[PDB]
Design a protein that fits this description.
The structure is cut from a larger assembly and holds two copies of chain A.
Chain A (H helix, E strand, L loop, with lengths): L1 E3 L5 E3 L38
Antiparallel strand pairs in A: 1-2
Bound molecules: a molecule of 2 linked components (NAG-FUC).
The site of a molecule of 2 linked components (NAG-FUC) has 3 residues of chain B, from loops.
Family (chain A): Belongs to the alphacoronaviruses spike protein family.
Subunit structure (chain A): Homotrimer. During virus morphogenesis, found in a complex with M and HE proteins. Interacts with host receptor.
Organism (chain A): Porcine epidemic diarrhea virus
Chain lengths: 50, 49
């Protein structure tokens, strides 16, 4: 797992490997097409709130 | 150095001690400390040692 916030910080399996400044937006791309959905780049993504 | 009394210098935690192997397992977390703040057991990434 990888999680990021509006502040831009990232946790690697909830660890916080590297620190960044404020990130406004992100564009992501991988094998996710619809067919490889079971074996896609990620598994589940959600808009989470504190 | 392993299983000997040596001068450890680890992630900004330094000192003298004897290291020992353990076979625990956790998919996350790399270091584990004591109530006082000293670190006893830990794992390394690439091998889970
Ligand atoms: C370490 O391994 C244990 C398995 O049995 C042990 O295997 C080796 C390491 C010898 O110590 C032998 O005498 C034992 O039979 C696990 O039960 C134990 O949980 C492991 N240690 C940790 C921290 O998980």
């Amino acid at each position: 797992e990888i999680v990021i916030t509006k502040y831009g910080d990232v946790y690697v399996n909830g660890f916080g490997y590297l620190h960044l400044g404020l990130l406004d937006a992100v564009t992501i791309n991988f094998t996710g097409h619809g067919t490889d959905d079971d074996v896609s780049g990620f598994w589940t993504i959600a808009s989470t709130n504190f | 150095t392993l299983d000997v009394c040596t001068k450890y210098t680890i992630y900004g935690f330094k000192g003298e001690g004897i290291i020992t192997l353990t076979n625990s397992s956790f998919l996350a977390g790399v270091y584990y400390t004591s109530d006082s703040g000293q670190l006893l057991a830990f794992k390394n990434v690439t091998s889970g040692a």
